Design an enzyme around this catalytic site. Structure first.
Site, PDB file in Angstrom:
ATOM      1  CB  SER A  63     -74.673 -37.781 -51.678  1.00 51.44           C
ATOM      2  OG  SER A  63     -73.483 -39.159 -51.042  1.00 51.44           O
ATOM      3  CE  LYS A  66     -71.710 -39.496 -55.099  1.00 46.51           C
ATOM      4  NZ  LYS A  66     -71.781 -39.446 -53.365  1.00 46.51           N
ATOM      5  CE1 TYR A 149     -74.722 -42.152 -54.053  1.00 43.58           C
ATOM      6  CE2 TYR A 149     -74.754 -41.969 -56.476  1.00 43.58           C
ATOM      7  CZ  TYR A 149     -74.752 -41.142 -54.587  1.00 43.58           C
ATOM      8  OH  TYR A 149     -75.155 -40.321 -53.652  1.00 43.58           O
ATOM      9  CD  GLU A 271     -79.065 -39.356 -58.896  1.00 40.89           C
ATOM     10  OE1 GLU A 271     -77.870 -39.658 -58.479  1.00 40.89           O
ATOM     11  OE2 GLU A 271     -80.588 -39.782 -58.880  1.00 40.89           O
ATOM     12  CE  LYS A 314     -76.662 -37.683 -55.661  1.00 41.98           C
ATOM     13  NZ  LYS A 314     -76.933 -38.061 -54.600  1.00 41.98           N
ATOM     14  CB  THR A 315     -81.074 -38.489 -51.787  1.00 40.27           C
ATOM     15  OG1 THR A 315     -80.565 -39.226 -52.522  1.00 40.27           O
ATOM     16  CG2 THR A 315     -82.585 -37.823 -52.021  1.00 40.27           C
ATOM     17  N   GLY A 316     -78.412 -36.326 -49.964  1.00 39.80           N
ATOM     18  CA  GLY A 316     -77.157 -36.917 -49.308  1.00 39.80           C
ATOM     19  C   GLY A 316     -78.088 -37.194 -48.106  1.00 39.80           C
ATOM     20  CB  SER A 317     -77.359 -39.906 -45.920  1.00 41.36           C
ATOM     21  OG  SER A 317     -78.202 -39.428 -46.392  1.00 41.36           O
TER      22      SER A 317
END
Length: 360
Positions: A63, A66, A149, A271, A314-317
Protein backbone atom coordinates in the site's frame (compact mmCIF):
# COMPACT_ATOMS: atom_id res chain seq x y z
CA UNK A 1 25.62 16.70 13.31
CA UNK A 2 25.69 12.90 13.11
CA UNK A 3 28.25 11.15 10.90
CA UNK A 4 27.26 8.35 8.54
CA UNK A 5 28.79 5.86 10.99
CA UNK A 6 26.89 7.32 13.95
CA UNK A 7 23.62 7.00 12.04
CA UNK A 8 24.63 3.47 11.05
CA UNK A 9 25.08 2.52 14.72
CA UNK A 10 21.64 3.87 15.59
CA UNK A 11 19.97 2.03 12.72
CA UNK A 12 21.73 -1.31 13.26
CA UNK A 13 20.86 -1.34 16.97
CA UNK A 14 17.17 -1.46 16.08
CA UNK A 15 17.20 -3.40 12.80
CA UNK A 16 19.48 -6.27 13.86
CA UNK A 17 17.21 -7.47 16.68
CA UNK A 18 14.14 -6.71 14.56
CA UNK A 19 15.22 -9.02 11.74
CA UNK A 20 16.11 -11.81 14.15
CA UNK A 21 12.92 -11.65 16.22
CA UNK A 22 10.62 -11.31 13.21
CA UNK A 23 12.62 -13.76 11.09
CA UNK A 24 12.96 -11.25 8.25
CA UNK A 25 15.33 -12.59 5.56
CA UNK A 26 16.38 -9.22 4.20
CA UNK A 27 15.85 -5.52 4.72
CA UNK A 28 16.87 -2.22 3.23
CA UNK A 29 16.56 1.03 5.18
CA UNK A 30 16.97 4.61 4.03
CA UNK A 31 17.42 7.44 6.51
CA UNK A 32 16.96 11.04 5.49
CA UNK A 33 18.86 13.12 8.03
CA UNK A 34 19.05 16.88 7.63
CA UNK A 35 17.84 16.36 4.07
CA UNK A 36 20.59 13.89 3.12
CA UNK A 37 20.16 10.18 2.27
CA UNK A 38 21.88 7.26 4.02
CA UNK A 39 21.38 3.65 2.92
CA UNK A 40 21.64 0.37 4.78
CA UNK A 41 21.10 -3.24 3.71
CA UNK A 42 21.04 -6.58 5.52
CA UNK A 43 20.37 -10.20 4.74
CA UNK A 44 19.14 -11.99 1.69
CA UNK A 45 16.92 -10.99 -1.21
CA UNK A 46 16.87 -14.61 -2.41
CA UNK A 47 17.50 -17.34 0.17
CA UNK A 48 17.71 -20.39 -2.10
CA UNK A 49 20.26 -18.78 -4.41
CA UNK A 50 21.94 -16.85 -1.59
CA UNK A 51 21.71 -13.38 -3.10
CA UNK A 52 22.12 -10.43 -0.73
CA UNK A 53 19.95 -7.36 -0.43
CA UNK A 54 21.67 -4.49 -2.25
CA UNK A 55 20.83 -0.85 -2.94
CA UNK A 56 19.22 -2.02 -6.16
CA UNK A 57 17.06 -4.76 -4.64
CA UNK A 58 13.39 -4.30 -5.53
CA UNK A 59 10.82 -4.79 -2.76
CA UNK A 60 7.02 -4.95 -3.13
CA UNK A 61 5.73 -1.74 -1.54
CA UNK A 62 2.20 -2.92 -0.98
CA UNK A 63 0.00 0.00 0.00
CA UNK A 64 2.85 2.51 0.02
CA UNK A 65 1.87 2.35 -3.69
CA UNK A 66 -1.09 4.52 -2.69
CA UNK A 67 1.25 7.49 -2.09
CA UNK A 68 2.36 7.30 -5.74
CA UNK A 69 -1.34 7.10 -6.66
CA UNK A 70 -2.12 10.21 -4.60
CA UNK A 71 0.72 12.24 -6.06
CA UNK A 72 -0.21 11.25 -9.63
CA UNK A 73 -3.76 12.33 -8.87
CA UNK A 74 -2.51 15.59 -7.39
CA UNK A 75 -0.48 16.13 -10.56
CA UNK A 76 -3.62 15.56 -12.65
CA UNK A 77 -5.44 18.16 -10.54
CA UNK A 78 -2.60 20.64 -11.06
CA UNK A 79 -2.78 19.96 -14.81
CA UNK A 80 -6.44 20.94 -14.77
CA UNK A 81 -7.42 17.46 -15.94
CA UNK A 82 -9.55 16.56 -12.92
CA UNK A 83 -11.06 18.17 -9.83
CA UNK A 84 -11.55 16.38 -6.52
CA UNK A 85 -15.10 17.74 -6.51
CA UNK A 86 -15.94 16.04 -9.83
CA UNK A 87 -18.53 13.27 -9.61
CA UNK A 88 -17.28 9.73 -10.22
CA UNK A 89 -19.89 9.46 -12.98
CA UNK A 90 -18.08 12.14 -14.98
CA UNK A 91 -15.20 9.71 -15.51
CA UNK A 92 -17.22 6.49 -15.53
CA UNK A 93 -20.66 7.30 -17.04
CA UNK A 94 -21.53 3.60 -17.04
CA UNK A 95 -22.00 3.82 -13.26
CA UNK A 96 -25.69 4.66 -13.58
CA UNK A 97 -26.67 3.46 -10.11
CA UNK A 98 -28.43 6.12 -8.05
CA UNK A 99 -26.20 5.25 -5.09
CA UNK A 100 -23.34 6.85 -7.03
CA UNK A 101 -24.93 10.29 -7.12
CA UNK A 102 -23.05 12.62 -4.80
CA UNK A 103 -19.89 10.49 -4.72
CA UNK A 104 -16.83 12.48 -5.83
CA UNK A 105 -13.26 11.66 -6.78
CA UNK A 106 -12.33 12.99 -3.33
CA UNK A 107 -14.52 10.34 -1.71
CA UNK A 108 -12.80 7.57 -3.67
CA UNK A 109 -9.33 8.92 -2.96
CA UNK A 110 -9.95 9.25 0.77
CA UNK A 111 -11.99 6.09 1.47
CA UNK A 112 -15.08 8.15 2.33
CA UNK A 113 -17.44 7.02 -0.46
CA UNK A 114 -19.58 5.01 1.94
CA UNK A 115 -18.02 1.64 2.59
CA UNK A 116 -16.45 0.41 -0.62
CA UNK A 117 -14.80 -2.91 0.42
CA UNK A 118 -11.20 -3.38 1.52
CA UNK A 119 -10.64 -5.77 -1.38
CA UNK A 120 -12.14 -6.06 -4.84
CA UNK A 121 -13.78 -9.53 -4.85
CA UNK A 122 -11.42 -12.28 -6.02
CA UNK A 123 -14.03 -13.59 -8.46
CA UNK A 124 -13.64 -10.37 -10.46
CA UNK A 125 -11.10 -11.08 -13.20
CA UNK A 126 -12.24 -8.86 -16.08
CA UNK A 127 -13.44 -5.33 -16.91
CA UNK A 128 -17.07 -6.38 -17.37
CA UNK A 129 -17.14 -8.02 -13.94
CA UNK A 130 -15.48 -4.99 -12.37
CA UNK A 131 -18.21 -2.75 -13.78
CA UNK A 132 -20.94 -5.01 -12.40
CA UNK A 133 -19.21 -4.97 -9.02
CA UNK A 134 -19.23 -1.19 -8.64
CA UNK A 135 -22.68 -0.94 -10.24
CA UNK A 136 -24.23 -3.28 -7.67
CA UNK A 137 -22.28 -2.02 -4.66
CA UNK A 138 -24.60 -0.72 -1.94
CA UNK A 139 -23.29 2.16 0.23
CA UNK A 140 -23.18 1.39 3.95
CA UNK A 141 -23.12 5.09 4.84
CA UNK A 142 -23.76 8.43 3.14
CA UNK A 143 -20.88 10.06 1.23
CA UNK A 144 -18.33 11.60 3.58
CA UNK A 145 -19.82 10.14 6.76
CA UNK A 146 -17.20 7.49 7.49
CA UNK A 147 -13.72 6.45 6.44
CA UNK A 148 -13.13 2.78 5.69
CA UNK A 149 -9.66 2.06 4.32
CA UNK A 150 -10.11 0.21 1.04
CA UNK A 151 -8.17 -0.83 -2.03
CA UNK A 152 -11.41 -0.72 -4.06
CA UNK A 153 -11.81 2.97 -3.24
CA UNK A 154 -8.44 4.59 -3.93
CA UNK A 155 -7.77 1.97 -6.59
CA UNK A 156 -10.69 3.28 -8.60
CA UNK A 157 -9.60 6.88 -7.96
CA UNK A 158 -6.25 6.22 -9.57
CA UNK A 159 -7.81 4.53 -12.59
CA UNK A 160 -10.21 7.43 -13.19
CA UNK A 161 -7.65 10.14 -12.40
CA UNK A 162 -5.55 9.25 -15.46
CA UNK A 163 -8.43 8.96 -17.94
CA UNK A 164 -8.22 12.53 -19.27
CA UNK A 165 -4.50 12.03 -19.94
CA UNK A 166 -5.28 9.29 -22.43
CA UNK A 167 -2.51 7.14 -20.96
CA UNK A 168 -2.74 3.93 -18.98
CA UNK A 169 -2.14 4.24 -15.24
CA UNK A 170 1.29 2.64 -15.64
CA UNK A 171 2.31 4.92 -18.50
CA UNK A 172 1.02 8.05 -16.74
CA UNK A 173 2.85 7.09 -13.55
CA UNK A 174 6.09 6.45 -15.44
CA UNK A 175 6.05 9.63 -17.48
CA UNK A 176 4.63 12.04 -14.90
CA UNK A 177 6.13 10.81 -11.63
CA UNK A 178 8.84 8.16 -11.91
CA UNK A 179 10.88 9.63 -14.74
CA UNK A 180 10.75 13.28 -13.61
CA UNK A 181 11.96 12.20 -10.16
CA UNK A 182 14.59 9.86 -11.65
CA UNK A 183 13.14 6.79 -9.97
CA UNK A 184 14.80 4.40 -12.43
CA UNK A 185 14.37 1.43 -10.11
CA UNK A 186 10.67 1.79 -9.40
CA UNK A 187 8.18 -0.32 -11.34
CA UNK A 188 4.58 -1.36 -11.62
CA UNK A 189 5.75 -4.15 -13.94
CA UNK A 190 9.32 -5.31 -13.31
CA UNK A 191 11.03 -5.73 -16.70
CA UNK A 192 12.87 -8.90 -17.61
CA UNK A 193 16.21 -7.06 -17.33
CA UNK A 194 15.56 -6.16 -13.70
CA UNK A 195 14.24 -9.47 -12.43
CA UNK A 196 17.70 -10.29 -11.12
CA UNK A 197 17.15 -7.50 -8.57
CA UNK A 198 13.57 -8.43 -7.66
CA UNK A 199 13.73 -9.91 -4.17
CA UNK A 200 11.56 -12.84 -3.26
CA UNK A 201 9.06 -12.17 -0.50
CA UNK A 202 8.75 -14.84 2.18
CA UNK A 203 5.64 -16.21 3.84
CA UNK A 204 6.06 -19.18 6.18
CA UNK A 205 9.58 -19.45 4.80
CA UNK A 206 8.40 -19.88 1.21
CA UNK A 207 9.35 -17.51 -1.64
CA UNK A 208 6.40 -15.64 -3.14
CA UNK A 209 5.62 -12.67 -5.36
CA UNK A 210 2.36 -10.72 -5.42
CA UNK A 211 -0.17 -12.08 -7.92
CA UNK A 212 -2.03 -9.98 -10.51
CA UNK A 213 -5.29 -8.49 -9.28
CA UNK A 214 -7.87 -5.86 -10.23
CA UNK A 215 -6.55 -2.30 -9.80
CA UNK A 216 -3.41 -3.73 -8.25
CA UNK A 217 -0.96 -1.14 -9.62
CA UNK A 218 -3.15 1.62 -8.22
CA UNK A 219 -3.55 0.17 -4.73
CA UNK A 220 -0.64 -2.09 -3.88
CA UNK A 221 1.47 -3.14 -6.85
CA UNK A 222 4.53 -0.90 -7.03
CA UNK A 223 8.05 -2.35 -6.53
CA UNK A 224 11.00 -0.10 -5.65
CA UNK A 225 14.57 0.02 -4.32
CA UNK A 226 15.92 1.66 -1.19
CA UNK A 227 17.60 4.41 -3.23
CA UNK A 228 14.42 5.27 -5.11
CA UNK A 229 12.34 5.24 -1.95
CA UNK A 230 14.79 7.60 -0.27
CA UNK A 231 14.33 9.91 -3.28
CA UNK A 232 10.56 9.50 -3.00
CA UNK A 233 10.68 10.55 0.65
CA UNK A 234 12.90 13.55 -0.10
CA UNK A 235 10.63 14.72 -2.93
CA UNK A 236 7.51 14.44 -0.81
CA UNK A 237 9.14 15.95 2.28
CA UNK A 238 10.28 19.08 0.43
CA UNK A 239 9.16 19.43 -3.18
CA UNK A 240 10.84 22.83 -3.58
CA UNK A 241 13.54 21.13 -5.66
CA UNK A 242 11.09 19.36 -7.98
CA UNK A 243 11.38 21.04 -11.39
CA UNK A 244 8.06 20.08 -12.98
CA UNK A 245 5.44 22.52 -11.69
CA UNK A 246 2.39 20.27 -11.70
CA UNK A 247 4.33 17.45 -10.02
CA UNK A 248 5.57 19.82 -7.32
CA UNK A 249 1.98 20.98 -6.84
CA UNK A 250 0.65 17.42 -6.96
CA UNK A 251 3.04 16.38 -4.22
CA UNK A 252 1.79 19.23 -2.05
CA UNK A 253 -1.85 18.37 -2.73
CA UNK A 254 -1.28 14.78 -1.59
CA UNK A 255 -0.43 16.14 1.87
CA UNK A 256 -3.37 18.48 2.16
CA UNK A 257 -5.65 17.44 5.02
CA UNK A 258 -9.05 16.46 3.65
CA UNK A 259 -10.54 14.69 6.67
CA UNK A 260 -9.72 14.25 10.34
CA UNK A 261 -10.24 10.81 11.87
CA UNK A 262 -9.35 10.98 15.55
CA UNK A 263 -5.90 12.57 15.54
CA UNK A 264 -5.01 11.41 12.03
CA UNK A 265 -5.57 13.45 8.87
CA UNK A 266 -6.23 11.85 5.49
CA UNK A 267 -4.32 13.13 2.48
CA UNK A 268 -4.15 11.55 -0.96
CA UNK A 269 -2.47 8.23 -0.17
CA UNK A 270 -0.40 9.79 2.61
CA UNK A 271 -1.75 9.95 6.15
CA UNK A 272 -0.63 12.63 8.59
CA UNK A 273 -0.53 13.45 12.28
CA UNK A 274 0.51 16.69 13.93
CA UNK A 275 4.15 16.90 15.05
CA UNK A 276 5.32 16.61 17.76
CA UNK A 277 3.50 13.50 18.85
CA UNK A 278 3.88 10.58 21.21
CA UNK A 279 4.66 7.07 19.99
CA UNK A 280 1.37 5.50 21.13
CA UNK A 281 -0.76 7.43 18.62
CA UNK A 282 1.02 6.06 15.56
CA UNK A 283 1.88 2.62 16.93
CA UNK A 284 -1.65 1.91 18.15
CA UNK A 285 -3.08 3.63 15.09
CA UNK A 286 -1.30 1.14 12.82
CA UNK A 287 -2.94 -1.88 14.45
CA UNK A 288 -5.62 -3.32 12.15
CA UNK A 289 -8.16 -2.80 14.94
CA UNK A 290 -7.87 0.90 14.13
CA UNK A 291 -6.38 1.09 10.64
CA UNK A 292 -9.06 -1.11 9.06
CA UNK A 293 -12.00 0.08 11.18
CA UNK A 294 -14.92 2.14 9.88
CA UNK A 295 -14.55 5.49 11.67
CA UNK A 296 -16.38 8.84 11.59
CA UNK A 297 -14.75 11.23 9.14
CA UNK A 298 -14.74 14.94 9.93
CA UNK A 299 -14.52 16.98 6.74
CA UNK A 300 -11.77 19.59 6.55
CA UNK A 301 -13.33 22.23 4.33
CA UNK A 302 -11.55 23.80 2.72
CA UNK A 303 -8.75 21.22 2.97
CA UNK A 304 -5.77 22.48 4.95
CA UNK A 305 -2.66 22.77 2.75
CA UNK A 306 0.31 20.55 3.60
CA UNK A 307 1.41 21.20 7.18
CA UNK A 308 5.19 21.08 7.62
CA UNK A 309 4.85 20.24 11.33
CA UNK A 310 3.51 16.77 10.54
CA UNK A 311 4.48 13.13 10.82
CA UNK A 312 3.62 11.90 7.31
CA UNK A 313 3.58 8.16 6.77
CA UNK A 314 2.24 5.02 5.11
CA UNK A 315 2.34 1.28 5.77
CA UNK A 316 2.23 -1.35 3.05
CA UNK A 317 2.11 -5.12 2.82
CA UNK A 318 1.75 -7.92 0.30
CA UNK A 319 1.83 -11.62 1.09
CA UNK A 320 5.62 -11.67 1.26
CA UNK A 321 6.66 -8.08 1.98
CA UNK A 322 6.26 -5.47 4.71
CA UNK A 323 7.13 -1.79 4.17
CA UNK A 324 6.88 1.48 6.09
CA UNK A 325 7.75 5.06 5.19
CA UNK A 326 7.61 8.10 7.47
CA UNK A 327 8.94 11.64 7.45
CA UNK A 328 8.69 14.93 9.34
CA UNK A 329 9.02 17.93 6.98
CA UNK A 330 9.70 20.35 9.83
CA UNK A 331 12.84 18.37 10.73
CA UNK A 332 13.90 17.27 7.23
CA UNK A 333 13.96 13.80 8.79
CA UNK A 334 12.63 10.56 7.37
CA UNK A 335 12.89 6.80 7.11
CA UNK A 336 12.14 3.98 4.67
CA UNK A 337 11.94 0.40 5.95
CA UNK A 338 11.70 -2.31 3.28
CA UNK A 339 11.48 -5.98 4.26
CA UNK A 340 10.89 -9.19 2.34
CA UNK A 341 8.61 -10.64 5.01
CA UNK A 342 5.35 -9.15 6.21
CA UNK A 343 5.42 -8.52 9.96
CA UNK A 344 3.01 -6.62 12.28
CA UNK A 345 2.48 -2.98 11.39
CA UNK A 346 2.84 -1.82 15.02
CA UNK A 347 6.26 -3.50 15.15
CA UNK A 348 7.30 -1.53 12.05
CA UNK A 349 6.10 1.78 13.43
CA UNK A 350 7.67 1.25 16.86
CA UNK A 351 11.02 0.40 15.24
CA UNK A 352 10.86 3.47 13.01
CA UNK A 353 10.01 5.63 16.02
CA UNK A 354 12.92 4.36 18.11
CA UNK A 355 15.30 5.14 15.28
CA UNK A 356 14.05 8.63 14.47
CA UNK A 357 13.78 9.52 18.15
CA UNK A 358 17.57 9.17 18.28
CA UNK A 359 18.04 11.41 15.25
CA UNK A 360 16.23 14.50 16.56
Amino acid sequence: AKTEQQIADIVNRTITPLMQEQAIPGMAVAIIYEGKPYYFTWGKADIANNHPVTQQTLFELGSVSKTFNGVLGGDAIARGEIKLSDPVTKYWPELTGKQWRGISLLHLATYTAGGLPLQIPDDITDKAALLRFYQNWQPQWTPGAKRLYANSSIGLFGALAVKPSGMSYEEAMTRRVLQPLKLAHTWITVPQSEQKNYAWGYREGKPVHVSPGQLDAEAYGVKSSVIDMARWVQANMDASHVQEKTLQQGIELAQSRYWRIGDMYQGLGWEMLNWPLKADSIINGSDSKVALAALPAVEVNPPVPAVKASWVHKTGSTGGFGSYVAFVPEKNLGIVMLANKSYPNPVRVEAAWRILEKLQ
